[PDB]
Structure formats: C-alpha cells, structure tokens
Design a binder for these strands. Structure first.
Ligand SMILES: [Ca+2]
Ligand SMILES: [Ca+2]
Length: 341
DNA sequence: AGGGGGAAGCCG
DNA sequence: CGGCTTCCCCCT
C-alpha cells in the first residue's frame, strides 16, 4: 500500500492571502470573534509570519494582539474556505477514487494500484502540488508512505510547501526515534500520561504490559500505538462519512432563562441546517456552562429531522439539560447534526 | 456481545 | 478557545 496525504498549508490564512495578495509576507491571523466584547474569542489559523511569534491557533485574540498588535486580524469566512476546499478535493479526485477527505484541509489518497514504486509517488505528489497551485493559488504539503499515519507524519515533517517520502527503512527508524507526542491522533493528555512513565517513543509502548498501557490511555489508543510500533498498521482509506455538522453561539450573558437561550439556539440550528448538504437523523443540543463545562443531550430518529421539528426537539433537549443541571448558568449554546443523508 | 449516548480528547 | 472525532461507559 502506497498512501499520499495532502495537507493544505495554513489553509484559512492562505485563502485570505489569495483573496488579498497584499497580505502576503505580513502576519495574518484568522480568528473566531465571539462578539461578546471586541477582541473576545480565539485565533483559528495563522500564517507563518504570525506563528513564528507565538501567534497560533487556540490562543485568545487579546493575547495575539498583545504579541502582534499590528498583524492583520480577519474573522472566519468558513463558506469561502469550504468552497475553495471542495474545489481542491474534487481536483484531488482526478488522481484517485480511493480518497478519504479527512477534514476541510486534509485528504488521504490510496495510489497503490496506480503507481507501483515510490518515485512515481513523489513525482505525482509534485504534479498534484503544481496543479493545485496553478488552479487555486494555494500551496499544500504532500506526505507519502506505507500507510495513512506515516503519510501524515511525512507531511508534518515537510510543512510548509513540502513533499516527503518515508520509505520502509525510515519507518523502522521512526518507530524508534519519533516522540509519542508527534504521533497523529495522540494529543497532550495521552502524551502526558505516557511521559509520566518514561514512555516517550513508539517503541517504548512495547516495553510496558498491555493491561497497564490500556489502564493509562484506554484500549483504543493502546491498540493503535502498539500496532504502529510493531509496524502492523494496515488501516485502509475509508471514503468520507464525517457526518457531524455543528453550530455554536455565545450568549449575550450567562443565564438559565430559556426565554433568552432558545432564541440563540434556533439561529444556531438555522445556520447549522444550511451548512449541511443532507438531512440529519440525529440532533444533539450542546451547552457550554459558566464553569466552561459542557453538557450534551441528543435524540436520534429512524427518519430525517426537518428544520421545524429540529426547533421543537432541540427545545425539549434544552429544557431537559436545564433539568439535568439545576445549578449552573449557560455561556454558550450550540447544536450538532449527525447521521446525515 | 452489541449499539446508543454523552463526556473526553485532539488539534487548528 | 472552538469545533469536530473518538471512545468508553452503560443498559439490555
Ligand atoms: Ca492541518
Ligand atoms: Ca500529534
């Protein structure tokens, strides 16, 4: 199996630069403004000119502005980014049908029965890059390896505007030298738990008894990590099915008054419904509380949920959450549409 | 043994 | 911080 992973470089910011070539070479900070205060909210994506100063995704906007007070701060334009992305994805479909659209800016291609050699793979990666740059004016990073995980590692190593192959031998070396924290799917929580016990590299997870590993990080990731370190990850390209579409709004203040909350919830459902190209069979209401804790209550039907009962159902789920948590106020309210068609 | 449902984790 | 995905209870 030969897998080619495509990772659109600093996507949102880069789309902004394409829409405005006068931004290129300037710190660009694409943010999610929350509307509560001016400058409230978080950074969503920043270009390299910004991230070289610590201004990156996840940090509060006011921190960003503290570090880089003269950068170009732009609000999320997700509909645009998504149009561009759908075009690049369609573009990618010409090179393979076995394709997994992992997210808005990431996609996996099984080019196995379509190259037969890693040279062809590299060259095809250059072809893909040149095509994408030519048609959509954005640079991507291509990773190529023996599976999805190492393709992604390759991309991670070559960002931005890179191309990288990880042959079998380099896989062998990587199992031994690559930090657990750099393993795709492994975040800071898992990495910290493992780090506490001297588990630092992939091969390290072999040194510890399975039951103990599972006891630390859960069966799933334990099986995952181990299979990687044994170089037995054989997982195939699964075509899409990412059936979650969400929408979240921050309330004008914290409150338990459904009379205040429900309105914002409906608009959320509204904007959620037109973002999706199909019908959800399951709806979940999601409340972010005042202590930032999150409550979910959802319902699935054997049929599609029209927007008009999405309102009713979601109001029921909301009231239900307000019974479930009699203590805290709500700070943000949202919805997740699942099981789409 | 199995499929929800809801909380925990990842990562831009 | 925000929005998705993963995962692991939990109750037949
Ligand atoms: Ca990415
Ligand atoms: Ca990682």
């Amino acid at each position: 199996m030969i897998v080619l992973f495509v990772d659109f470089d600093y996507f949102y910011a880069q789309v902004e630069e394409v829409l405005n070539p006068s931004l290129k070479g300037k710190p660009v900070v694409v943010c999610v403004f929350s509307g509560r205060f001016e400058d409230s909210g978080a950074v969503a994506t920043a270009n390299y000119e910004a991230r070289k100063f610590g201004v990156k995704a996840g940090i509060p906007i006011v921190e960003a502005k503290k570090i880089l007070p003269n950068a170009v701060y732009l609000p999320m334009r997700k509909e645009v980014y998504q149009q561009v992305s759908s075009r690049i994805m369609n573009l990618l479909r010409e090179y393979s049908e076995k394709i997994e659209i992992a997210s808005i800016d990431e996609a996996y291609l099984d080019i196995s029965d379509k190259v037969r050699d890693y040279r062809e793979a590299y060259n095809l990666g250059l072809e893909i890059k040149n095509k994408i740059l030519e048609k959509e004016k954005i640079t991507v990073t291509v990773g190529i390896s023996k599976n999805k995980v190492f393709a992604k590692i390759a991309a991670d190593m070559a960002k931005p505007n890179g191309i990288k192959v990880i042959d079998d031998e380099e896989v062998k070396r990587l199992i031994r030298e690559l930090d657990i924290a750099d393993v795709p799917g492994i975040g800071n929580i898992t990495a910290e738990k493992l780090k506490k016990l001297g588990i630092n590299k992939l091969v390290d997870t072999l040194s510890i008894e399975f039951d103990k590993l599972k006891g630390m990080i859960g069966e799933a990731k334990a099986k995952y990590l181990i299979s990687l370190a044994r170089d037995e990850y054989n997982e195939p390209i699964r075509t899409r099915v990412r059936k979650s579409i969400g929408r979240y709004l921050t309330l004008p203040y914290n409150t338990r008054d459904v009379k205040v909350i429900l309105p914002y919830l409906k608009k959320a459902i509204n904007e959620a419904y037109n973002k999706v190209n199909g019908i959800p069979m399951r709806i979940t209401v999601i409340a972010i509380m005042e202590d930032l804790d999150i409550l979910s209550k959802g319902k699935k039907f054997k049929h599609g949920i029209s927007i008009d009962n999405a309102y009713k159902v979601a109001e029921d789920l909301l009231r239900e959450l307000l019974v479930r948590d009699k203590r805290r106020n709500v700070r943000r309210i949202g919805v997740k549409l699942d099981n789409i068609i």
